[PDB]
Amino acid sequence: LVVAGEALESQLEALAGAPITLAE
Amino acid sequence: RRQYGMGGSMGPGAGAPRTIAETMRVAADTRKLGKF
Amino acid sequence: MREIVHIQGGQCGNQIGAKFWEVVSDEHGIDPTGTYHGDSDLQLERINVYFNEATGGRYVPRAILMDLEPGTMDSVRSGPYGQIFRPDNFVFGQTGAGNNWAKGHYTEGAELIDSVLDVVRKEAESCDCLQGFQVCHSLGGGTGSGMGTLLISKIREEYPDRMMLTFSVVPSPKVSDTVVEPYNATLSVHQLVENADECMVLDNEALYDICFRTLKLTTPTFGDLNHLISAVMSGITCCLRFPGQLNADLRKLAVNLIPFPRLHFFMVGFTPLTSRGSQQYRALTVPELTQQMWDAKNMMCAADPRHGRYLTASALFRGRMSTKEVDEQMLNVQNKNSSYFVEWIPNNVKSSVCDIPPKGLKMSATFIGNSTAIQEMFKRVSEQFTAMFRRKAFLHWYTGEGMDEMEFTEAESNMNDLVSEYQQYQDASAE
Amino acid sequence: AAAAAAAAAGAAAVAAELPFVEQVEEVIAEAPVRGPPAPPPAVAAAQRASRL
Amino acid sequence: MREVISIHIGQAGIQVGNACWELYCLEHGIQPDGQMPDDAFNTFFSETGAGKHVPRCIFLDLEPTVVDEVRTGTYRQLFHPEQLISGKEDAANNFARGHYTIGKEIVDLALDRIRKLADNCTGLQGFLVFNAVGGGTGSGLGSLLLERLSVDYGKKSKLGFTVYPSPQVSTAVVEPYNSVLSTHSLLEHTDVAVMLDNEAIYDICRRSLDIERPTYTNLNRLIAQVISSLTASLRFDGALNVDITEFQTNLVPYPRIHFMLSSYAPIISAEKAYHEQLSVAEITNAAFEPASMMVKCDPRHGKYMACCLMYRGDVVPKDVNASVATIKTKRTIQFVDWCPTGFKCGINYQPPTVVPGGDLAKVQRAVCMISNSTAIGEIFSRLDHKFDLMYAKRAFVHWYVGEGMEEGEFSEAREDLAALEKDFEEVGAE
Ligand SMILES: Nc1nc2c(ncn2[C@@H]2O[C@H](COP(=O)(O)OP(=O)(O)OP(=O)(O)O)[C@@H](O)[C@H]2O)c(=O)[nH]1
Ligand SMILES: Nc1nc2c(ncn2[C@@H]2O[C@H](COP(=O)(O)OP(=O)(O)O)[C@@H](O)[C@H]2O)c(=O)[nH]1
């Protein structure tokens, strides 16, 4: 029965971390 | 990717940072939750 | 024609209210059977403030007595002045709250609170104009504190603009009567800060000290302490019931006393309290009343004013006196004890004068002090509550009545906030 | 126009100094009427002297 | 023909009105029942079919106790039952309460009765508003009523006998607050505002009357004597007749500067009576003494702008002229350079009547000196920091905000009082 909050800052961290290289 | 990293830096970059009755009435909820 | 609805909660509240109604009936010349026998016109002029006209010449208190156990109000009804109350105003359950604030506020008081508010509404709607409600009860008790806080919340919801006055017997510092006094006090202070407009703080041990030192009784039973509390409770509203040279209603006292909304707790005292030995030796004069008024021992609150600073102080005098005498005495008090008076308020005295002193005293005076001294009392409650709350002692009862743990932490957080408010205004400097 | 461009550059520099200073866009049904924020007492005295 | 409408707002207003109307009844011979056993009462009283005289007064209050005291007292058959207007809830020393929320219906009824009273007057010299600056009823309701009267009646001269807080001694805590608010309100609505201070009247009673225990009844008796001496020229003939309308023309150099000190002389008990000459020169000197002033303000600090003297009793134009010449030649009393005359002397042949049971003695001469002087800005300087000291912490500001006020209103009132301070300095300057 918990309601919990997911911080969007994790998604910003995921966006800031990208492999790129030859793949992108 | 650089722009997104700049935004990610800004996020926590902003996250990191009258009468006295008002001064403590504005922060009473924060005090209660933190003390719990 | 500005009516006051009296409410009594718990055993302590019921006993104090019974003594209070005996005192008020004596002041208004009402015998225990309800007939007026005062032979005195100003007594009947404003009798509607507290009483209602019955079919005969009888008068009924506008009082609502609440409990979860029948014994306390069985004793109250069988007491000397038990027959004045309307039996419909006795709202009580069958199983008492075992000194459990959770039981008195959530489980058992909640079913009874519907009837309580029904009686409250019935009594209030009959009033022409309503000054407000006064609730007498004790912090540190289950049914009293719990149902009192619940009723105060409900009445605050119903009548936001009407005055709310509370007389709470705070648990004494040095000797504790019930074990869970710090929990009950912490939970009830949280409600009183938010809801009650004006609150009076009383201490049994301070009353014992005053009645053994100034009054010098040998075995003061609870009746004597209740008589002191009733004297203060009558004197606080005598300006409504009697003509005054400089009259002051409850709202005037609230405006002149409360600088900031949450700092509405006061320490009170009554003068002149004389031992029977020195009644002849004392001189009953305005300077003497003021000197006894501003004594730390005369304070009915455990906290002594010397440690703190008086934010404000109202003094309701009663009797044929010189307003120049009164005003000069209070100005002299402020100039002499300027260290004990807050600097950023140019005048710290709200002086009221009523032309009708209580029976037996040519002059009298009730004192209501808003000082930062109550900080240390809230601090002591903090020190006890935290001590038990670290080990969750006696907490499982409040848990099992359907109360979150976080309600306790919120209550104590608010009470610590009030503590720090008092400190900050005590040490606040002008400019 | 050159002066205006210099002013805009200075505003950009101030924005760089203080990242994302809040500006209230509008108010929607502020239930109690709220007046302008009170100035510091020295500024209030200066404004009083200006009015006098 | 020379009717003046009296208004009494708040406890202090009603209690000084008790003394004032007792004094007028004693002066005109009107018994407390209403009737007396030519036409000198018309200024204050209108006679009805039975011959009963009813005063042209209105007792307004939001608290029922003070008015019911009159309804029960000896003056129950004199005043009109609807003239006594009672509220339900007191203003509780809240200007917002007395001006914004509770006072509305009461002031509407007040204007209704005031219109009824004014329709009973052929002429109307003006209004005498008696209130207490320093309380919600006195400040808020009085300010509202003054505003309404200025709006509708128009040219009627409104004289406000305001009782202001004493410098050091006081009985209220929000008294600087509502005093500043009411001062801002009446700076533009009253025509002549008279300052009174309880501390100064207490000092007068302590020294001149030798009363070690003065009280409100004593204070109101002195105030009533002052007001009766003020109005004596309207009701009784005498050399150099003085008028309500010409109080302004002889007294108010500029409309802002219309706050006035009052001083009575002699203030002597019966035992000290008939022991000194009490000549015109001596009583004028006493009236210009700092102790005789009914406001705690040293006149030596500022400079007098105008001084209106009302003499009652055996006073001759030579005596008043010689006394005023001596006062002008006196070095301590300092007048402004721009008002070479600065004096309005007016005599009345009716000596001041003495209220039985009072302490004032039967003196064949009396002086009421009402002075417009720039020294009065000094008490305003007192209230101006008593205000701002609390206003820095916004103490008791929530009480006023709750009944429909704003921080801007306090700021505007305090700024207006600062502008009044600047005005006093400029007018004192050359
Ligand atoms: N000189 C003099 N002053 C008085 C007398 N009675 C009251 N005052 C002053 O009047 C002030 C308050 O008057 P009011 O505002 O009318 O009191 P109230 O009738 O209860 O009305 P509120 O207080 O506004 O709710 C006090 O500060 C007193 O100093 C009096 O008899 N003589
Ligand atoms: N002054 C006074 N205090 C009392 C009396 N009876 C109880 N108390 C105090 O009230 C406190 C709380 O008791 P109470 O709230 O009435 O218990 P409850 O009825 O079960 O809620 C106790 O610490 C007692 O010291 C009395 O008759 N007079």
Q: Phi, psi (5° rounding) for residue E282?
A: -65, -45
3-state helix, strand, coil in chain A (%, to 5): 35, 0, 65
Taking alpha carbons only, the member of C368, C376, C216 closest to residue C293 is: C368
* H helix count then E strand count, chain B: 3, 0
Rounded CA gap, C354 and C242, in Å? 7
* Centroid of ligand 1 to alpha carbon of E54 (angstroms): 26
Contacts of C243 in chain E (CB under 8 A): 65, 68-69
Contact C300, C372 (CB under 8 A): no
Rounded CA gap, C51 and E365, in Å? 55
CB contact under 8 A, C244 and E65: yes
Q: How many CB atoms within 10 Å of residue E354?
A: 17
Q: For residue E217, which atom of ligand 1 is closest to its CA?
A: 31
Rounded CA gap, E88 and C256, in Å? 20
Contact E57, E13 (CB under 8 A): no
Q: Phi, psi (5° rounding) for residue C402?
A: 90, 35
CB contact under 8 A, D20 and B18: no
> Which residues form the pocket of ligand 2, taking CB atoms under 6 Å from any ligand atom?
C 10-12, 15-16, 99, 138, 140-144, 169, 171, 177-178, 204, 222, 225-226
Interface residue D38 vs chain B (CB under 8 A): yes
SS (H, E, C) chain C: CEEEEEEEEHHHHHHHHHHHHHHHHHHCCECCCCCECCCCHHHHHCHHHCEEECCCCCEEECEEEEECCHHHHHHHHHCCCCCCCCHHHEEECCCCCCCCHHHHHHHHHHHHHHHHHHHHHHHHHCCCEEEEEEEEEECCCHHHHHHHHHHHHHHHHHCCCCEEEEEEEECCCCCCCCCCHHHHHHHHHHHHHHCCCEEEEEEHHHHHHHHHHCCCCCCCCHHHHHHHHHHHHHHHHHHHHCCCCECCCHHHHHHHHCCCCCCCEEEEEEECCCCCCCCCCCCCCHHHHHHHHCCCCCCCCCCCCCCCCEEEEEEEEECCCCHHHHHHHHHHHHHHCHHHECCCCCCCEEEEEECCCCCCCCCEEEEEEEECCHHHHHHHHHHHHHHHHHHCCCHHHHHHCCCCHHHHHHHHHHHHHHHHHHHHHHCCCCC
Q: For residue C98, which atom of ligand 2 is closest to its CA?
A: 20
- For E128, the 3-state DSSP assignment is strand
Chains A and D make contact, 3+ CB pairs within 8 Å: no
Residue C204 marked ligand-binding: yes
DSSP run (H or E) holding E163: strand E157-164
Method: cryo-EM
Contact E8, E16 (CB under 8 A): yes
CA distances from C108 to C67, C96, C184 (A): 10, 8, 16
Which among B21, B32, B35 has the least Cβ separation from residue C421?
B21
Rounded CA gap, E153 and E121, in Å? 13
Contact C355, C404 (CB under 8 A): no
Taking alpha carbons only, the member of E388, E343, E339, E348 closest to residue E366 is: E348
Q: Phi, psi (5° rounding) for residue C110?
A: -70, -40
Q: What sign does the CA torsion over E201, E232, E51, E128 have?
A: negative
CA distances from E104 to C255, C284, E98, E142, E213 (A): 21, 44, 8, 11, 39
Which among A12, A13, A18 has the least Cβ separation from residue B1?
A18
Q: Phi, psi (5° rounding) for residue E247?
A: -50, -50
- Read off the tokens for C352: 């009221």
Which among D35, D41, D48 has the least Cβ separation from residue E407?
D35
Q: For residue C249, which atom of ligand 1 is closest to its CA?
A: 20
Rounded CA gap, C71 and E299, in Å? 71
C-alpha of C39 from chain center: 30
Q: How many CB atoms within 10 Å of residue E291?
A: 12
Contact E214, E220 (CB under 8 A): no
Identity of the amino acid at E326: T
Rounded CA gap, E167 and C316, in Å? 22
Rounded CA gap, E399 and E97, in Å? 9
**Which residues are E1's β-sheet partners?**
none
Rounded CA gap, E75 and E311, in Å? 29
Q: Phi, psi (5° rounding) for residue E323?
A: -60, -45
The two beta strands, C265-271 and C364-371, are antiparallel
Taking alpha carbons only, the member of C123, C98, C119, C110 closest to residue C153 is: C110
Angle, alpha carbons E55-E111-E59 (nearest 5°): 40
Interface residue B7 vs chain A (CB under 8 A): yes
Token pair 């023909």 is at which residue? E1
Contact E364, E314 (CB under 8 A): yes
Q: For residue C171, which atom of ligand 2 is closest to its CA?
A: 23
Rounded CA gap, C181 and C185, in Å? 6
Give the distance from residue D15's alpha carbon to the nearest chain B alpha carbon, in angstroms. Answer: 13
Rounded CA gap, C373 and C363, in Å? 28
Contact E284, E327 (CB under 8 A): yes
In the A/B pair of chains, how many CB contacts fall below 8 A?
A: 22
Task: Sheet containing C198-203: give its strands across.
Answer: C90-92, C63-67, C2-9, C129-138, C163-170, C198-203, C265-271, C364-371, C310-318, C349-354
- For E60, the 3-state DSSP assignment is strand
* Centroid of ligand 1 to alpha carbon of E410 (angstroms): 21
Rounded CA gap, E168 and C328, in Å? 10
The two beta strands, C163-170 and C59-61, are unpaired
Residue C104 marked ligand-binding: no
Residue whose CB lies within 8 A of the most ligand 1 atoms, among E15, E163, E173, E175, for a mutation test: E163
Contact E37, E31 (CB under 8 A): yes
Residue E220 marked ligand-binding: yes
DSSP run (H or E) holding E149: helix E142-152
Which among C261, C409, C414 has the least Cβ separation from residue B28?
C414
The yes-or-no answer on residue E246 being catalytic is: yes
Contacts of C186 in chain B (CB under 8 A): none
**Which residues are C9's β-sheet partners?**
C66
DSSP run (H or E) holding E229: helix E216-235
- Read off the tokens for D10: 């200075």
CA distances from C379 to C168, C392, C407, C414, E159 (A): 17, 19, 19, 12, 55
Chains A and E make contact, 3+ CB pairs within 8 Å: no
Distance between first and last Cα of chain C: 44
CB contact under 8 A, C421 and B24: yes
Resolution (A): 3.5
Residue C416 marked ligand-binding: no
- Read off the tokens for E243: 């008028």
Contacts of C428 in chain B (CB under 8 A): 20
Taking alpha carbons only, the member of E8, E6, E358 closest to residue E215 is: E358
Residues of chain C with a CB closer than 8 angstroms to some CB in chain B: 260-262, 405-406, 409-410, 412-414, 417, 420-421, 424-425, 428
3-state helix, strand, coil in chain D (%, to 5): 50, 0, 50
Contact residues for C178 (Cβ-Cβ < 8 A; gap 6+): C99, C140, C141, C171, C184
Taking alpha carbons only, the member of E262, E372, E369 closest to residue E310 is: E369
Catalytic residue among E47, E69, E147, E246: E246
Which among B19, B21, B35 has the least Cβ separation from residue C413?
B35
Q: What sign does the CA torsion over E381, E382, E383, E389 have?
A: positive
Rounded CA gap, D7 and E265, in Å? 71
- Hey, what long-range contacts does E252-257 have (CB within 8 A, 24 or more apart)? E252/E191, E252/E192, E252/E306, E252/E372, E253/E305, E253/E306, E253/E339, E253/E372, E253/E427, E254/E423, E254/E427, E256/E187, E256/E420, E256/E423, E257/E305, E257/E372, E257/E374, E257/E423, E257/E424, E257/E427
Chains A and B make contact, 3+ CB pairs within 8 Å: yes
Rounded CA gap, C173 and C302, in Å? 7
Establish how many alpha carbons lie within 13 A of residue C45's alpha carbon, considering only the half-sphere containing its beta carbon: 16
Residue E63 marked ligand-binding: yes
Residue E89 is classified by DSSP as S
Residue B23 is classified by DSSP as H
Residue E74 is classified by DSSP as G
Query: Which ligand lies nearest the alpha carbon of C225?
Result: 2
Residue C89 marked ligand-binding: no
Taking alpha carbons only, the member of C177, C184, C131, C180 closest to residue C9 is: C184
Contact residues for E27 (Cβ-Cβ < 8 A; gap 6+): E228, E235, E350, E353
Identity of the amino acid at C359: K
Question: Which residue's alpha carbon is at the smallest distance from atom 23 of ligand 2?
Answer: C177
Rounded CA gap, C339 and E155, in Å? 52
Identity of the amino acid at E218: N
Token pair 């009686």 is at which residue? C119
Rounded CA gap, C325 and C317, in Å? 11
Q: How many CB atoms within 10 Å of residue C70?
A: 14
Angle, alpha carbons E352-E353-E357 (nearest 5°): 130
The 10 Å CB-count burial string (b at 16+, else e) for D13-46 is eeeeeeeeeeeeeeeeeeeeeeeeeeeeeeebee
Rounded CA gap, C234 and E209, in Å? 37
CB contact under 8 A, B24 and C261: no
Rounded CA gap, C112 and C67, in Å? 9
- For E312, the 3-state DSSP assignment is strand
- For E107, the 3-state DSSP assignment is helix
CB contact under 8 A, D33 and E406: yes
Token pair 């509202």 is at which residue? E144
Residue E136 marked ligand-binding: yes
- Read off the tokens for C345: 């308020």
Q: Alpha-carbon dihedral of residues E2, E8, E9, E12, nearest 10 degrees?
A: 140
- Read off the tokens for A18: 């990208």
Contact C44, C36 (CB under 8 A): yes
CA distances from E47 to C105, E1, E56 (A): 66, 13, 10
> Which residues form the pocket of ligand 1, taking CB atoms under 6 Å from any ligand atom?
C 246-247, 252; E 10-12, 15-16, 61, 63, 66, 90-93, 98, 132, 134-138, 163, 171-172, 198, 216, 219-220
Question: Which residue's alpha carbon is at the smallest distance from atom 18 of ligand 1?
Answer: E11
CA distances from C352 to C235, C319, E33, E225, E414 (A): 11, 11, 32, 26, 28
Contacts of E405 in chain D (CB under 8 A): none
Interface residue E408 vs chain D (CB under 8 A): yes
Contact residues for E19 (Cβ-Cβ < 8 A; gap 6+): E217, E220, E221, E223, E224, E355
* Centroid of ligand 1 to alpha carbon of E162 (angstroms): 11
CB contact under 8 A, D48 and E407: no
CB contact under 8 A, C1 and E64: yes
